[PDB]
Amino acid sequence: NEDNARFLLLAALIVLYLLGGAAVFSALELAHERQAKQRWEERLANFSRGHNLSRDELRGFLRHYEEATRAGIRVDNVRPRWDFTGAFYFVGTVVSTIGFGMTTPATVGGKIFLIFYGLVGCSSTILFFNLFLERLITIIAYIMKSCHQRQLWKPSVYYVMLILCTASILISCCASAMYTPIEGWSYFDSLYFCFVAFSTIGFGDLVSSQNAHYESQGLYRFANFVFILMGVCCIYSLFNVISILIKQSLNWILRKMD
Amino acid sequence: NEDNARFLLLAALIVLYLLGGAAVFSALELAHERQAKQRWEERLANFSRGHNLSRDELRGFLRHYEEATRAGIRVDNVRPRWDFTGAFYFVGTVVSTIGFGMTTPATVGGKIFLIFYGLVGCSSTILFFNLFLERLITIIAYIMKSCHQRQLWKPSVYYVMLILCTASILISCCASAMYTPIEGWSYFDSLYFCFVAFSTIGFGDLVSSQNAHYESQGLYRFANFVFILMGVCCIYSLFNVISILIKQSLNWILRKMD
Numbered sequence: 209n210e211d212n213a214r215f216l217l218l219a220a221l222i223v224l225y226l227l228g229g230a231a232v233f234s235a236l237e238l239a240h241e242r243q244a245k246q247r248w249e250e251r252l253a254n255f256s257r258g259h260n261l262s263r264d265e266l267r268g269f270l271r272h273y274e275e276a277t278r279a280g281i282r283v284d285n286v287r288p289r290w291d292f293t294g295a296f297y298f299v300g301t302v303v304s305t306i307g308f309g310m311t312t313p314a315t316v317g318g319k320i321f322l323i324f325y326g327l328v329g330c331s332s333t334i335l336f337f338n339l340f341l342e343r344l345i346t347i348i349a350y351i352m353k354s355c356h357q358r359q360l361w362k363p364s365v366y367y368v369m370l371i372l373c374t375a376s377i378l379i380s381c382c383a384s385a386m387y388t389p390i391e392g393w394s395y396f397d398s399l400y401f402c403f404v405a406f407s408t409i410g411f412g413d414l415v416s417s418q419n420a421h422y423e424s425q426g427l428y429r430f431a432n433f434v435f436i437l438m439g440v441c442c443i444y445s446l447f448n449v450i451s452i453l454i455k456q457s458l459n460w461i462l463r464k465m466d
Numbered sequence: 467n468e469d470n471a472r473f474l475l476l477a478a479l480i481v482l483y484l485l486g487g488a489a490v491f492s493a494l495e496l497a498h499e500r501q502a503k504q505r506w507e508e509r510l511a512n513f514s515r516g517h518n519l520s521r522d523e524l525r526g527f528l529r530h531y532e533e534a535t536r537a538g539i540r541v542d543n544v545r546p547r548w549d550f551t552g553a554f555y556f557v558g559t560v561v562s563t564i565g566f567g568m569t570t571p572a573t574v575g576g577k578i579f580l581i582f583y584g585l586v587g588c589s590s591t592i593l594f595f596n597l598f599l600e601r602l603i604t605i606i607a608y609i610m611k612s613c614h615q616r617q618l619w620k621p622s623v624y625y626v627m628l629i630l631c632t633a634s635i636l637i638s639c640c641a642s643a644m645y646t647p648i649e650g651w652s653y654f655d656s657l658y659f660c661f662v663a664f665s666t667i668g669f670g671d672l673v674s675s676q677n678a679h680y681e682s683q684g685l686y687r688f689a690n691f692v693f694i695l696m697g698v699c700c701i702y703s704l705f706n707v708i709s710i711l712i713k714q715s716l717n718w719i720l721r722k723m724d
């Protein structure tokens with residue numbers, strides 16, 4: 209049946225996409241990993257020699273620092289993790305499935321409660337993004353009909369994709385223009401953070417709204433909430449729309465394979 | 467219009483869900499954060515006093531260790547990040563949007579390439595999970611019809627939810643029974659990892675398949691790939707099904723509000 213042929217074809221194409229990506233990423237920056245690890249080994253050797261410290265004592269101390277960093281210590285001045293604001297940021301990253309993982313539950317009660325809270329929250333949010341998308345399609349259809357009348361049916365998926373690309377770029381550039389002066393990131397690092405957050409990938413190498421102090425903290429936190437919400441809804445809509453164009457491309461490939 | 471009333475009602479309910487979660491999590495484990503941070507300050511003081519080291523030199527050394535850990539050093543013996551196997555794990559976490567973030571791109575070329583690779587990969591995968599769900603619904607309908615004939619229409623959403631709960635528990639218990647002896651995690655930590663991976667939240671506090679060596683590495687990596695794939699597809703299906711039951715509950719609340 210054609211639905212099974214589509215499913216197996218898509219699985220094969222995704223597996224080839226993973227093998228191709230793995231072949232590319234290991235070529236771009238395996239050299240950088242090995243340089244940074246060599247430079248670390250040189251720094252650790254210099255520290256060992258300079259202070260008459262054995263690698264045993266240093267490995268013990270660094271094991272304690274690995275424990276402390278999971279509790280949320282940093283050498284930079286970082287906001288408390290489980291004040292009400294930090295917990296609100298945490299639940300925001302759970303419920304959107306971004307999961308930066310700078311804050312993570314540590315008690316068994318927290319671990320248990322997460323499994324139910326994330327279970328209902330993530331379902332409620334995937335509902336929210338589907339209602340958002342249906343509203344956005346309705347708004348675009350209304351505007352396009354008003355333009356058709358102003359020149360005196362629903363929009364096609366390609367023009368919706370071109371609209372959502374424009375929205376995603378405009379939000380991402382505004383967010384980058386906010387994070388660049390406030391967080392001190394480079395502009396390109398802030399664009400990369402914007403994509404990593406809005407796609408809900410969320411590695412957590414960069415996280416906004418973390419220093420112990422900012423000018424106008426409340427306004428900055430509110431703007432960060434608004435920008436992350438708008439970005440996630442726009443890029444998740446873009447993912448759905450591209451997924452529909454992929455499905456149509458698979459149906460075309462299977463038709464041409466007839 | 468009823469669609470706007472549903473959208474605004476769901477936004478209000480989600481905002482109250484975030485405020486309630488933030489109020490709960492900050493109560494469960496703010497005491498643990500402050501204990502672990504005090505114990506760290508005590509360890510750092512003991513190390514400073516014991517080796518005649520100033521907090522300036524130690525802060526410098528720890529800043530270098532924060533740089534080295536982002537390049538993927540650990541005190542434990544950890545697998546190279548950007549060999550072909552590590553890059554395949556990375557792209558697996560990008561394309562599923564899990565994003566554990568133990569491996570992250572560091573060159574500008576890697577950061578650029580991620581924005582296009584994740585853009586097409588995540589759309590292709592959200593397509594894959596929607597084809598998976600349509601196939602699973604078709605299989606459940608066929609089996610239920612065969613049972614109706616064996617007792618000699620599509621299934622209702624509630625029984626699909628009860629099936630997907632059972633599948634998610636059975637996969638999660640099998641995965642936990644694999645990770646517990648091999649990774650040395652506690653059983654409950656491995657269940658929590660299973661949920662955090664399968665929901666695609668992916669904090670990255672726990673990550674499987676990371677030590678420099680295992681018995682039967684190839685079989686273990688293959689089993690880890692299979693279990694994470696099956697888990698993500700089952701729990702993402704469960705999220706969709708619960709989101710439909712939420713939508714029906716909102717429609718009921720709006721009807722009763724008439």
Ligand SMILES: CCCCC/C=C\C/C=C\CCCCCCCC(=O)O
Nearest residue numbers: 297300301304417429433436437477
């Ligand atoms: C009004 C509708 C709300 C819908 C919410 C749904 C999903 C949540 C999505 C994104 C929010 C999480 C990002 C961080 C927010 C807190 C930022 C801060 O405090 O610094």
Ligand SMILES: CCCCC/C=C\C/C=C\CCCCCCCC(=O)O
Nearest residue numbers: 219555558559562675687691694695
């Ligand atoms: C056959 C169909 C494949 C579909 C793939 C789609 C999405 C990918 C989802 C999950 C895989 C990522 C988890 C880690 C895999 C590598 C594990 C390892 O190497 O240790």
Ligand SMILES: [K+]
Nearest residue numbers: 306409564667
């Ligand atoms: K994620």
Ligand SMILES: [K+]
Nearest residue numbers: 308411566669
């Ligand atoms: K993460």
